[PDB]
Amino acid sequence: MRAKWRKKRMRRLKRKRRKMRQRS
Amino acid sequence: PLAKDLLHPSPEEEKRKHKKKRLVQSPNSYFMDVKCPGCYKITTVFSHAQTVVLCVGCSTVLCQPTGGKARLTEGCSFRRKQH
Amino acid sequence: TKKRRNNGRAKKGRGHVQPIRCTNCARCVPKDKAIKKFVIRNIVEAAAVRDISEASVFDAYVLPKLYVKLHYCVSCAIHSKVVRNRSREARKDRTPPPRFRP
Amino acid sequence: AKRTKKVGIVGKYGTRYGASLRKMVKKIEISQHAKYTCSFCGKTKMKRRAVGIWHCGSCMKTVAGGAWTYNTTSAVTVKSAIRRLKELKDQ
Amino acid sequence: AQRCKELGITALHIKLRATGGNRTKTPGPGAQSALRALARSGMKIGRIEDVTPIPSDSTRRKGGRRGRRL
Amino acid sequence: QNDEVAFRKFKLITEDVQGKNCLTNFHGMDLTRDKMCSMVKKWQTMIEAHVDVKTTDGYLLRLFCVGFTKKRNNQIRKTSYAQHQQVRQIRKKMMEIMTREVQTNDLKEVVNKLIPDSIGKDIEKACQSIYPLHDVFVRKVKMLKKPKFELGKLMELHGE
Amino acid sequence: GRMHAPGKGLSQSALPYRRSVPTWLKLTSDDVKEQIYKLAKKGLTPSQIGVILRDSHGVAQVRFVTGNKILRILKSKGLAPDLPEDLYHLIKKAVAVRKHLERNRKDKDAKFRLILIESRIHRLARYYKTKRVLPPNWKYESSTASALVA
Amino acid sequence: KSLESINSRLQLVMKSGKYVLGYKQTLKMIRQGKAKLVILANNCPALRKSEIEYYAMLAKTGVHHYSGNNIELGTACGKYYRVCTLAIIDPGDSDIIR
RNA sequence: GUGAAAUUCUUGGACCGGCGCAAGACGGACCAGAGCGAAAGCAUUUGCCAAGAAUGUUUUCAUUAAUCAAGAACGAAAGUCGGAGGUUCGAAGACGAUCAGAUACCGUCGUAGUUCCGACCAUAAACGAUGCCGACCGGCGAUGCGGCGGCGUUAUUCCCAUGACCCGCCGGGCAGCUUCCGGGAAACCAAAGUCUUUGGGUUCCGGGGGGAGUAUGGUUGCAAAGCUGAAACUUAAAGGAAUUGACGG
Ligand SMILES: [Mg+2]
Ligand SMILES: [Mg+2]
Ligand SMILES: [Mg+2]
Ligand SMILES: [Mg+2]
Ligand SMILES: [Mg+2]
Ligand SMILES: [Mg+2]
Ligand SMILES: [Mg+2]
Ligand SMILES: [Mg+2]
Ligand SMILES: [Zn+2]
Ligand SMILES: [Zn+2]
């Protein structure tokens, strides 16, 4: 991938991870 | 020129060089006798004077400060001090 | 590798240069980077100058000029062939091409 | 010592009304209860009496001002504009 | 030209216009042919002037900052 | 005019019509597009000034003057740029010698003296002591307000 | 280079190699001292006193003609300023910038210059407290500095 | 230049000349006839300003309307309090020309 | 309007031409390998307010300095919050085309935004991919500012001053050309030189490629996110500069 889009994908994944952890 | 004589530079380049970059520092300024017409006394004025020099016997200006050198008023005479 | 010493633009002692829009595609180009052509063209064609002169109500009428400054991004400049790629040694000169007066 | 980290004057509202609403009302309450320097006597005794009314304790001068500040930026620009139009009107 | 001649107009001043504004300033392909046809139709020609709208500065031109990608 | 230049245009709005004759009066003047674009050139500084000035008879005019720095015949330097203070002094000078040629005279003798652009000529003459200028013209003037349209004034402008 | 600017200027004064008093100078040491006293009573800082003396009365160096510097002479007579000249001028500049800034809140350039000026003030005050020119407890307060200058 | 010049001249009137700060003392000095210059802040009450101007007209002494206020005039005097009216007995520094 | 179209607007006068009005943006050409600013950045006129480099100085103080963990100020654009404003452009969205498909490139419309005020955020290929201070080491022609000296031309005036040119010198800048100074893997660099002939002072920072700027902890933020920041495991290369060939809608 383009590095910028890998960065965007990682940011989306990190928001999802934060939401999952906050739910606990 | 690998063999320039740094010890004894001729006065031409000694004068063209910057005041600090000379072999020995020498100011580019001097002192001058100034004669105002219609007056008898002689005023000693710095060549690069930053202030308006005035005569005490006449309400007349002798020099006007500029960027580099004081511009003498027209009609005034001047000579050097000891070169 | 660094292709050009000036990085393809004239910005030397500046931080930011305002952008302009390419006359061909309306791309935002830095003003010092864009290719500028100052075209000064007769407002009528060189084929039609004689017809306009004949149909003029005046005798010594000087035909007006048309003064247009065109800005190009390098993409449109290369596609429109105003500029061309050059060899590594030939890139270094800045002399404009001759006007070919004769 | 420092008693609150960030709430300051809106610590009296406790946990109620929402953090953003408390933050919004904080600066308004600070300006409301602040003492301004009187422009007539020079003392820092010009404080709000009611909404829009600002009284000075010393010279007993009452001024019509803003609801929460002594003067509003709107009114300041208005005063400058009226002065400019007056000096343009006369010659 | 023939309409002008039958309504009794003999000479014409010319005002050439391009799109102007923030858009292109070069006149289209039809200006030369239109003016040449007017000249060759017998109509007399007087002053000629460009009246393209030139902004002292305009609103943002359409197309985005990356331009019209083609 | 019989033999004047062609790059100057006048607006000449119509106020009154009588019989089969519409009668015009001055509304503004402008230089032409080609003349202005030919005057604008690189490696030189142009000074632009504008002034709102009222005539004696109540016509308010906005005047726009332009000037361009001139390179000397023996000049070797490519550019002829005026410093900011020089430009400011030139602008102030050419504003204050457009005011006084309008304030103290009527619209008729304002128009007849901007017909040869004598205002620009004296501006260029006056500004030579700061920086030489060559292409100095009153680029534009526009009417801002008009005084009530006296038909007697219109008729004396047309006839005698 | 400059302390707080990216400038590397060289404009200085080139004192001549001849330390001797010129023969055309008729002013004696006491005469120059009296002139300095009169100018200091008029209120001139030592830099201005030196400038006036050099421009008008033709004296090249007060130290060369009298043997002492202008500040030394003023302090010996007992009329030297309470604050040093350069520190006073730095505080004056800081007060002026703060006065401008309290009306122009968006002047972030002025805020940056104010930070630079106050840093210079604190460094110079540290130097003077080290040299015991200033009291050991001397501190520059932005609020109360306005009454010290002008 | 006028404001900074008058501020510097006031600073040199302080510490080198005899002055007096305040309304009551200013009036007392004026009616003793030894006040040579009276400085009034623009913050001054209009009645007080008019009365001091009348006193100065009677005493043939000058009045300068400082372009500050009482706070800024106190700062110019170098004090940490507001001064609204002040008088100079003798300048000592050519603020008052002989 | 486009490659061609179509969505769309149009006998209700669309487009076009003329005269006005209103609004909000934007300050073309002049505009440059030009200037200023610590960077970000800065271009209509005029006024006010403070600030500043360089220059000139036979002024003053006399080492007051350089770089700097922690800390602090500013910090494009986007984004967030509150209030105004909203012309144009235009994320999202809708539609028409194109296509095998077309959530796109092209076209029409259009929300947030783009504008101003106040408060956050602290990130950019925030670039010279190049720390600061100091010294030395080639030539040349220019350019900007200041100063100095000179044949002359020009502006008025009666002459010098003072401007505009011309010829030089000096200092501080933006740079450029050239060179077997020298360096470098080379591209190239008068600095990226004065380095095995290795030491001027000082700050930050890298240790094969991935995992990974990820997990977790802490901290900052309204949020988006910012700062600090692993390991398991995996891999024999990944990369840089140049050469030849092949290929290029
Ligand atoms: Mg490449
Ligand atoms: Mg940048
Ligand atoms: Mg293409
Ligand atoms: Mg921003
Ligand atoms: Mg908003
Ligand atoms: Mg649109
Ligand atoms: Mg170091
Ligand atoms: Mg590694
Ligand atoms: Zn393009
Ligand atoms: Zn009060």
Swiss-Prot record, chain A:
<keyword id="KW-0689">Ribosomal protein</keyword>
<keyword id="KW-0687">Ribonucleoprotein</keyword>
<dbReference type="GO" id="GO:0005737">
    <property type="term" value="C:cytoplasm"/>
</dbReference>
<dbReference type="Pfam" id="PF05162">
    <property type="entry name" value="Ribosomal_L41"/>
</dbReference>
<dbReference type="GO" id="GO:0003723">
    <property type="term" value="F:RNA binding"/>
</dbReference>
<comment type="subunit">
    <text>Component of the small ribosomal subunit.</text>
</comment>
<comment type="similarity">
    <text>Belongs to the eukaryotic ribosomal protein eS32 family.</text>
</comment>
<dbReference type="GO" id="GO:0003730">
    <property type="term" value="F:mRNA 3'-UTR binding"/>
</dbReference>
<dbReference type="GO" id="GO:0002181">
    <property type="term" value="P:cytoplasmic translation"/>
</dbReference>
<dbReference type="GO" id="GO:0005783">
    <property type="term" value="C:endoplasmic reticulum"/>
</dbReference>
<dbReference type="GO" id="GO:0003735">
    <property type="term" value="F:structural constituent of ribosome"/>
</dbReference>
<dbReference type="GO" id="GO:0005829">
    <property type="term" value="C:cytosol"/>
</dbReference>
From Swiss-Prot, chain D:
<dbReference type="GO" id="GO:0005829">
    <property type="term" value="C:cytosol"/>
</dbReference>
<dbReference type="GO" id="GO:0008270">
    <property type="term" value="F:zinc ion binding"/>
</dbReference>
<protein>
    <recommendedName>
        <fullName>Large ribosomal subunit protein eL43</fullName>
    </recommendedName>
</protein>
<keyword id="KW-0963">Cytoplasm</keyword>
<dbReference type="GO" id="GO:0022625">
    <property type="term" value="C:cytosolic large ribosomal subunit"/>
</dbReference>
<feature type="binding site">
    <location>
        <position position="38"/>
    </location>
    <ligand>
        <name>Zn(2+)</name>
    </ligand>
</feature>
<keyword id="KW-0479">Metal-binding</keyword>
<dbReference type="InterPro" id="IPR011331">
    <property type="entry name" value="Ribosomal_eL37/eL43"/>
</dbReference>
<dbReference type="Pfam" id="PF01780">
    <property type="entry name" value="Ribosomal_L37ae"/>
</dbReference>
<comment type="similarity">
    <text>Belongs to the eukaryotic ribosomal protein eL43 family.</text>
</comment>
<comment type="function">
    <text>Component of the large ribosomal subunit. The ribosome is a large ribonucleoprotein complex responsible for the synthesis of proteins in the cell.</text>
</comment>
<feature type="binding site">
    <location>
        <position position="56"/>
    </location>
    <ligand>
        <name>Zn(2+)</name>
    </ligand>
</feature>
UniProtKB/Swiss-Prot annotation, chain G:
<dbReference type="Pfam" id="PF00312">
    <property type="entry name" value="Ribosomal_S15"/>
</dbReference>
<dbReference type="GO" id="GO:0003723">
    <property type="term" value="F:RNA binding"/>
</dbReference>
<dbReference type="InterPro" id="IPR012606">
    <property type="entry name" value="Ribosomal_uS15_N"/>
</dbReference>
<dbReference type="GO" id="GO:0033119">
    <property type="term" value="P:negative regulation of RNA splicing"/>
</dbReference>
<dbReference type="InterPro" id="IPR023029">
    <property type="entry name" value="Ribosomal_uS15_arc_euk"/>
</dbReference>
<dbReference type="GO" id="GO:0022627">
    <property type="term" value="C:cytosolic small ribosomal subunit"/>
</dbReference>
<dbReference type="GO" id="GO:0042274">
    <property type="term" value="P:ribosomal small subunit biogenesis"/>
</dbReference>
<dbReference type="GO" id="GO:0002181">
    <property type="term" value="P:cytoplasmic translation"/>
</dbReference>
<dbReference type="GO" id="GO:0003735">
    <property type="term" value="F:structural constituent of ribosome"/>
</dbReference>
<dbReference type="GO" id="GO:0070181">
    <property type="term" value="F:small ribosomal subunit rRNA binding"/>
</dbReference>
<dbReference type="GO" id="GO:0003729">
    <property type="term" value="F:mRNA binding"/>
</dbReference>
<dbReference type="GO" id="GO:0005840">
    <property type="term" value="C:ribosome"/>
</dbReference>
Swiss-Prot record, chain H:
<comment type="function">
    <text>Component of the large ribosomal subunit. The ribosome is a large ribonucleoprotein complex responsible for the synthesis of proteins in the cell.</text>
</comment>
<dbReference type="GO" id="GO:0014069">
    <property type="term" value="C:postsynaptic density"/>
</dbReference>
<keyword id="KW-0007">Acetylation</keyword>
<feature type="modified residue" description="Phosphoserine">
    <location>
        <position position="8"/>
    </location>
</feature>
<keyword id="KW-0963">Cytoplasm</keyword>
<dbReference type="InterPro" id="IPR000231">
    <property type="entry name" value="Ribosomal_eL30"/>
</dbReference>
<dbReference type="GO" id="GO:0005634">
    <property type="term" value="C:nucleus"/>
</dbReference>
<dbReference type="GO" id="GO:0003735">
    <property type="term" value="F:structural constituent of ribosome"/>
</dbReference>
<dbReference type="InterPro" id="IPR039109">
    <property type="entry name" value="Ribosomal_eL30-like"/>
</dbReference>
<dbReference type="GO" id="GO:0022625">
    <property type="term" value="C:cytosolic large ribosomal subunit"/>
</dbReference>
<dbReference type="GO" id="GO:0005925">
    <property type="term" value="C:focal adhesion"/>
</dbReference>
<dbReference type="GO" id="GO:0050829">
    <property type="term" value="P:defense response to Gram-negative bacterium"/>
</dbReference>
